[PDB]
Amino acid sequence: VEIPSSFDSRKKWPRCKSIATIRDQSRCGSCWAFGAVEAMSDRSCIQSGGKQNVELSAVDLLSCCESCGLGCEGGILGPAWDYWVKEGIVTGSSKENHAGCEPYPFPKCEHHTKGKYPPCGSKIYKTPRCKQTCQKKYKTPYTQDKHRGKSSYNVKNDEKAIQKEIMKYGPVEAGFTVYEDFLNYKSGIYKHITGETLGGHAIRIIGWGVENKAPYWLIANSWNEDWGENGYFRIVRGRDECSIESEVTAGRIN
Template structure:
């Protein structure tokens, strides 16, 4: 029996089972029943696949045992599955799975994989999908029991029961930069790298001023959230705290649609071009919904906040137009990134995310050897500081999976070795505040 139509994935046969039919005995009409029907009647759920019997109907589809009293035709098992219930041992008529018994057609779910009692090779087997899940208890145990790993893993409930492919598609969302973008000129400021602070945190240096932790939900929106958050941070810092906007990631998801894919991912360079040329509104004006919401900002007709349907800030300095930034610039190495953060604020970074990162709970992350190397996706995060612990240098970064993930929504990752490519594509911008006026729309 071909099961690829139902699963489309690797299957695991577990234990045999058969089902005793109710229609049997010498007084039954000889038939044939299922044998007289098209072959397709043995698959799926087709009420038309029935035959008259004893003043009622018997069925030949795979859901014939749809009631507490079986209504399969007498030749269902022999014709459709090559099973003779009368000759099948009693011990093979029950499906044993995880210590429990299941009847034919019964479905169960184990973590992110579905299982079903199905006829295979002249018997009934419990067939299960075998996809990797976002959260795997075995992986958590391997990480936590490895003394060489400097971080801990745990079950993050919102990710339990979801396939790893779902996480890569909908919990990340940054598309690999185009080759031309990788050629972006890197800034190389003049400074003494040996005098760089051993540790620094934008959260401490600018307390209660940095963008909060967000939860992108099941929407590949990291590209939009980090762009809006880094821009928000830069406006606070570059205006000396006079402008404190929380800028809208939803505007990027909904309105920055040329070359972007909304919840299916976006390019960082295109997001920054939109922020520079069109300008962003605040979160209150266009709140985040984590979905493909229609763009309601008439950005082609006006450049002002009021004309965009937003309420301009009431406290000085008075801003009339949307929030815009300079062209984005790339940062070339570890110390350049540190210098940028300490002088201008948090930066945007792209990293590879492997299966174990979804289960990170605390410590200094480094990809473990227990994950499939070929399964990963790209994700944008906001680096807000750095430090070292027990001789291990790390970056402090803000994620977008909610405050209950990781270290209150943040994580630390090994610094200076380009772990998970986190130092390969790091972006900074200059915020055009009302005070500096340069480049402000209008």
């Protein structure tokens, strides 16, 4: 396949409303579960030609996956996509939308940036319990609201392989190393210049582009719309910046 010089999943599949939705993980290390349910929502819609047009529940995966790690204390991508294949994930919107089977219990907060939400601060919530119960107004039983995948895989640590995966099958989840300067990001094309490691972050890659000859990935963060470029950031593409090309995971419904 010829790879275009830029690609935006939001523009290829505009009927799939999840693709342009920015979420907020709140005071919780649930990034691993947000990048997962976001990319699964997108891919469920894209691969079903818009038939499965849903917002999958971050709290269902976060609270119920026994193999994914430590809930609000952080997690692992492979087992999140295996959970989607094996048990599936119910629907559920943000806390403020309170739509679907299991909406997120935690409110929007600012992640080391200025804006109109309360600051996240340094304390995290306890991981919610696995309740397996749809909100009272939702009239599908929990187990009947499950959306499943067929396959999950790691994507090759190769720029062109990742571009082909995104443009054919949809946004992907990806891990990268967070250095302190990432917390100062306001706009433009991120690269690590200053600061020590703060650990790992999991995000959603939706496309790519080039500006002033600088190639980038276009990424949806889960820190609400006030963070970065209306909730998005760009990061140098092609040099495995912060290991962005080395921890890509996704999956298919068919």
